[PDB]
Design a protein around this ligand. Sequence first.
Ligand SMILES: *[C@@H]1O[C@H](CO)[C@@H](O)[C@H](O)[C@H]1NC(C)=O
Ligand SMILES: *[C@@H]1O[C@H](CO)[C@@H](O)[C@H](O)[C@H]1NC(C)=O
Ligand SMILES: *[C@@H]1O[C@H](CO)[C@@H](O)[C@H](O)[C@H]1NC(C)=O
Ligand SMILES: *[C@@H]1O[C@H](CO)[C@@H](O)[C@H](O)[C@H]1NC(C)=O
Length: 309
Amino acid sequence: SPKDCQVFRSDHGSSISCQPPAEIPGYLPADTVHLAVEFFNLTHLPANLLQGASKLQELHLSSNGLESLSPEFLRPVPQLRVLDLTRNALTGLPPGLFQASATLDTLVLKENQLEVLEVSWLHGLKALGHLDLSGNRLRKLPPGLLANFTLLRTLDLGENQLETLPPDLLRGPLQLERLHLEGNKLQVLGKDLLLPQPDLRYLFLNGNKLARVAAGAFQGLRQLDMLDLSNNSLASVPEGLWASLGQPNWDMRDGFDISGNPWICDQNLSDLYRWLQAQKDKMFSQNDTRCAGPEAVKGQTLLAVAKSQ
Ligand SMILES: *[C@@H]1O[C@H](CO)[C@@H](O)[C@H](O)[C@H]1NC(C)=O
Ligand SMILES: *[C@@H]1O[C@H](CO)[C@@H](O)[C@H](O)[C@H]1NC(C)=O
Ligand SMILES: *[C@@H]1O[C@H](CO)[C@@H](O)[C@H](O)[C@H]1NC(C)=O
Ligand SMILES: *[C@@H]1O[C@H](CO)[C@@H](O)[C@H](O)[C@H]1NC(C)=O
């Protein structure tokens, strides 16, 4: 039949995929463990779609044009581990949506149309490990957002319109691993934002409007594997900024990228020159890391000017 979904009876249980011309099932098999319902065109799903699905662990509801969710949608699946709502038209979440969702690990709200983030929309999440809010229209983040997510590993906020970051943004997770802030409108990075996460591994800050990094901003970073600062508006950086990054302290799994910045290569960059000389086999985009001035060295690479001392 062409109206039936695709079941894959397996050792855990079924995995079911529905896309047109298939029909959204009115009930789920009791042993459904993974459910994907995508490429439909509906303002909302049936509020009781998940009824009885007490083995469901992963719910992929990508690209359906959804504009709202029922407040009771997840009540039949307190054991849910992964909820993925990529590429829908959500502008908010109903209150209490997550009241019984204490074991949810991954929440993906990538590419909806959230313009604000209400702290109360996440009430009830506590085991959260992966929070993906990228590709929305957020300008501002409320205080206390992450304070309960002790187990948070990844925070993805890239490709929003964020103009500032609240100072307490990283204060709840015990050991954040990856922080995606690329493609926003951030302009400064303060002394304290990264203080709660000394063992952060991945920091993506590229494609912002970054003009100033406070001198102590990286003071406590002990094991950074990837630092992307590329594509910003940095003309200089203070002395000491890099003292704990890279060699000789840490062998970065990937490295760093400071390309696409209007570097001003005078003696205020000598500390960066020194640091760059010790890290060159970890330097991405070296050919695009060039001085914007002064006129004598305009257009030359940082490394060439660094090598020249
Ligand atoms: C979805 O449904 C509405 C009304 O039926 C329609 O205007 C819209 O073009 C449809 N298709 C897509 C891709 O959104
Ligand atoms: C964190 O936990 C308390 C409940 O003890 C709650 O009042 C507060 O709203 C929670 N914060 C978030 C973002 O859920
Ligand atoms: C950085 O990267 C690409 C080009 O490298 C481009 O989007 C733009 O010049 C910079 N990023 C932005 C504005 O988000
Ligand atoms: C970057 O390197 C490519 C080839 O490696 C070269 O075309 C270019 O001249 C370099 N610098 C530029 C475009 O400023």
